[PDB]
């Protein structure tokens, strides 16, 4: 079957800079009817893919001029001019010339932008959760760059190294920034053992950690 090889897997680009994504078919992809069915798709996280370019170099309706396709027989390129936060996601090429039709592996766009210090927000467990005998204490670290960050939890002045569930979004479609959620999963009974809860964010921007805390009573 025709193999489509996309390179690179991940593509660093500066905000405002041109991106160039490569896709290589293992052999030629001209359909019997003469058309070259090379299509480029963009998939944002949580959403379905959407067509950008079809028949190698034709823009789909609603697609800005900033996107263009080119290439020849086995070697195809997507070019994005003036890369923007809205262009974030995974890019895929697709060949529909020879059955079985096949997709490339995907190219994730990584935008390069200025540093941003995280916002920190902390959230006691809700009464509705407590009612059922659980107690998730959640802290969001929002809108930072670059991606590397440390989070420290403190419970009545004693640090909680362990049992912290951390999850990360992909770059934000508005400002090309990252966000992280950090959760302490406790029981209602274990949560009420303590009074003070604190979430501390250490990020290269600042030598001082950014701090939020609450008290149960």
């Amino acid at each position: 079957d025709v193999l489509m090889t996309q390179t690179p897997l991940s593509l660093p680009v500066s905000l405002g800079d041109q991106a160039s994504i490569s896709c290589r078919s293992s052999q030629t992809i001209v359909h019997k009817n003469g058309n070259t069915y090379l299509e480029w798709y963009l998939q944002k996280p949580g959403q379905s893919p959407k067509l950008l370019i079809y028949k190698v170099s034709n823009r789909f309706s609603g697609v800005p001029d900033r996107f263009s396709g080119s290439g020849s027989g086995t070697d195809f390129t997507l070019k994005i001019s003036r890369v923007e936060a809205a262009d974030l996601g995974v890019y895929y090429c697709f060949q529909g010339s020879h059955v079985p039709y096949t997709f490339g592996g995907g190219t994730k766009l990584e935008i390069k932008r200025a540093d941003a210090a995280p916002t920190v927000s902390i959230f006691p467990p809700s009464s509705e959760q407590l009612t059922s005998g659980g107690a998730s204490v959640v802290c969001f670290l929002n809108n930072f760059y670059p991606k590397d960050i440390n989070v420290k939890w403190k419970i009545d002045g004693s640090e909680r190294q362990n049992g912290v569930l951390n999850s990360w979004t992909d770059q934000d479609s508005k400002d090309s920034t990252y966000s992280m959620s950090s959760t302490l999963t406790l029981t209602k009974d274990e949560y009420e053992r303590h009074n003070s809860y604190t979430c501390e964010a250490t990020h290269k921007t600042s030598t001082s950690p950014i701090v939020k805390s609450f008290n149960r009573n």
């Binding site: 996280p45 895929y92 969001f140 990360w168 950014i210």
Partner: protein
């Protein structure tokens, strides 16, 4: 006015079969071919097959022995059947119009996440992450929804039915023992926060759960 609506199960037992109906509106099946694609973290995007306008079907050879695509032209419906499902057939299944020449009916369905498992369906519990003043920095306030203890994937979370799209962060699901948890956050101005109501809309289609949770100050 172009739509590809998909209905099918979240959960299917190992070795049983999968049936998914794609309902088209906007174009006619006597004029256009419809494809089926799946997405899985293992093998990325895989093209499975196509039923062309005249009723001819072609299939990906790797699945040809267990796969069946048919349709009803008058109902605008395309049917996907896969037999003998195994654990790594877990994926999002899409009906799609793609590989276009002349027309402009390029569209993907919402997808049906099919989980191949013997486990049973559990809806989420939806808890508000009500800010308090410890959830504010500068002029902005960050709000949240915790969606806890559900199976199978997916849940979808919007804020204000999708009208609030800027500043929305939806964190990927993670497995705690045998149930999924996820959170979502929205950041808004502190000016909006006395007067405005902010709502998170959680849907778990495997269990027909549709919950609107009002987030308010602490």
């Amino acid at each position: 006015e172009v739509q590809l609506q998909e209905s099918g199960p979240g959960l299917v037992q190992p070795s049983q079969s999968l049936s998914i109906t794609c309902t088209v509106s906007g174009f006619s099946l006597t004029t256009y071919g419809v494809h089926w694609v799946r997405q899985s973290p293992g093998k990325g995007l895989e093209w499975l097959g196509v039923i062309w306008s005249g009723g001819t079907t072609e299939y990906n050879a790797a699945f040809i022995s267990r796969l069946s695509i048919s349709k009803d032209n008058s109902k605008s419906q395309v049917f996907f059947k896969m037999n003998s499902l195994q654990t790594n057939d877990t994926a999002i299944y899409f009906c799609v119009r793609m590989r276009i020449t002349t027309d402009w009916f390029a569209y993907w369905g919402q997808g049906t996440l099919v989980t191949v498992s013997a486990a049973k369906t559990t809806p989420p519990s939806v808890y508000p992450l009500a800010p308090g003043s410890a959830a504010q920095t500068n002029s902005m306030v960050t709000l949240g929804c915790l969606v806890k203890g559900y199976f199978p994937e997916p849940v979808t979370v919007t804020w204000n039915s999708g009208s609030l799209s800027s500043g929305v962060h939806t964190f990927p699901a993670v497995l705690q023992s045998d149930l999924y948890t996820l959170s979502s956050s929205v950041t808004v101005p502190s000016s909006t926060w006395p007067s405005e109501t902010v709502t998170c809309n959680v849907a778990h289609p495997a269990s027909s759960t549709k919950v609107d949770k009002k987030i308010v100050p602490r």
